[PDB]
Design an enzyme around this catalytic site. Structure first.
Site, PDB file in Angstrom:
ATOM      1  N   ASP A  35       1.005  -1.162   0.069  1.00 52.99           N
ATOM      2  CA  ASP A  35       0.085  -0.003   0.090  1.00 52.99           C
ATOM      3  C   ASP A  35       0.933   1.222  -0.032  1.00 52.99           C
ATOM      4  O   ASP A  35       1.354   1.621   0.969  1.00 52.99           O
ATOM      5  CB  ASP A  35      -0.808   0.045   1.107  1.00 52.99           C
ATOM      6  CG  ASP A  35      -1.698   1.038   1.404  1.00 52.99           C
ATOM      7  OD1 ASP A  35      -1.738   1.878   0.172  1.00 52.99           O
ATOM      8  OD2 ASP A  35      -2.377   1.568   2.414  1.00 52.99           O
ATOM      9  N   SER A 199      -0.628  15.464 -11.930  1.00 54.00           N
ATOM     10  CA  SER A 199      -0.805  15.028 -13.235  1.00 54.00           C
ATOM     11  C   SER A 199      -1.027  16.541 -14.173  1.00 54.00           C
ATOM     12  O   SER A 199      -1.601  17.451 -13.727  1.00 54.00           O
ATOM     13  CB  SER A 199      -2.046  14.247 -13.339  1.00 54.00           C
ATOM     14  OG  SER A 199      -2.411  14.002 -14.808  1.00 54.00           O
TER      15      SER A 199
END
Ligand code: RAY
Length: 330
Positions: A35, A199
């Site tokens: 994770d 992004s």
């Protein structure tokens, strides 16, 4: 040193991925959910409340000659999906894919929430976010990667998750045969303890690319792709019959639909998520309403590039003094 381990989807939907991890001496092999969106290595154990164990493999520290109770240490985590676990702490030897750390904090669960009990395939979590998010008290413990870093050939790990297929976690090296083209690296902020990056935009299907900054986290422990409501609406508007369902908890779509791809930007590069990766199947057995793999982050507080996004890429988690993330197509 290096390590390399295969990671395997737990079910036919890729809801999560499990990676075998050797703990203790002799080794006890548990299948952990790696994770990157979190920083505790915790396991089902001989200490876990018996009614909360339902088929998981447990770590029994009393059977490990290298286990040592970390005196006074406790841990307690609450995850973004509402699940939680807590317990005490041992140090022990932990190996992943041939890479061994001695003295790793292994957090033994005394209590786990129902979603963990109900998932017999996940024996615990191995956190790979920054150690500043580790929950052990009163002395904060380091992640497996943080403990291994100095010994690794290069201070990196890579995630190569498969679509409906196994993939690979590598530590200490970049397998140049595992991706196409080049890896585009992008800046990371560690201010929140996460692999947080920005992004450069998105496209829906064959549509034009929209240049816009989307700050989010690379989180292997989250199944889906959670993005701003504007972006998510633009995606599902291209699927006839798709709608947001408050009762189901997100966007659903007709199972007869063919889904468009979704592209996200990494600098000037582009990662394309095929439409099929966005199908999470019937909302309930036999239903013709299917659950979408791109959902709004509006109620989260952060955008999350979960498995839906990451499995479309070869992803480099560069833990150099100034961390960065790399993405390549594959
Ligand atoms: C320094 O730890 C304070 C206690 O934190 C509890 C806690 O739930 N933390 C947490 C929850 C989700 C992800 C993650 F990385 C950390």
């Amino acid at each position: 040193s290096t390590g390399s381990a295969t990671t395997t989807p737990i079910d036919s939907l890729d809801d999560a991925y499990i990676t075998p991890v050797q703990i203790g001496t002799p080794a006890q092999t548990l299948n952990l959910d790696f994770d990157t969106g979190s920083s505790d290595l915790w396991v089902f154990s001989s200490e876990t409340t018996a009614s909360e164990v339902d088929g998981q493999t447990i770590y029994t520290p009393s059977k490990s000659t290298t286990a040592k109770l970390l005196s006074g240490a406790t841990w307690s985590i609450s995850y973004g999906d509402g699940s939680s676990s807590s317990g005490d702490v041992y140090t022990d030897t932990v190996s992943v894919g041939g890479l061994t750390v001695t003295g790793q904090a292994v957090e033994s669960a005394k209590k786990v929430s129902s979603s963990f009990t109900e998932d017999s395939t996940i024996d615990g979590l191995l956190g790979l976010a920054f150690s500043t998010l580790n929950t052990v008290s009163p002395t904060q413990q380091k992640t497996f990667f943080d403990n291994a870093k100095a010994s690794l050939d290069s201070p990196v790990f890579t995630a190569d998750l498969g679509y409906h297929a196994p993939g690979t976690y590598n530590f200490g090296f970049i397998d140049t045969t595992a991706y196409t083209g080049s890896i585009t690296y992008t800046a990371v902020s560690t201010k929140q303890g996460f692999w947080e990056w920005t992004s450069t935009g998105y496209a829906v299907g064959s549509g034009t690319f929209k240049s816009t900054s989307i700050d989010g986290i690379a989180d292997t422990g989250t199944t889906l792709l959670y993005l701003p409501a504007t972006v998510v609406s633009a995606y599902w508007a291209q699927v006839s019959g798709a709608k947001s369902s408050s009762s189901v908890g997100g966007y659903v779509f007709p199972c007869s639909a063919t889904l468009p791809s979704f592209t996200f930007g990494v600098g000037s590069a582009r990662i394309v998520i095929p439409g099929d990766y966005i199908d999470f199947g019937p909302i309930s057995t036999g239903s013709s309403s299917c659950f979408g793999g791109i959902q709004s982050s509006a109620g989260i507080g952060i955008n999350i590039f979960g498995d839906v996004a990451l499995k479309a890429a070869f992803v480099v988690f560069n833990g150099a003094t100034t961390p960065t993330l790399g993405f390549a197509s594959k």
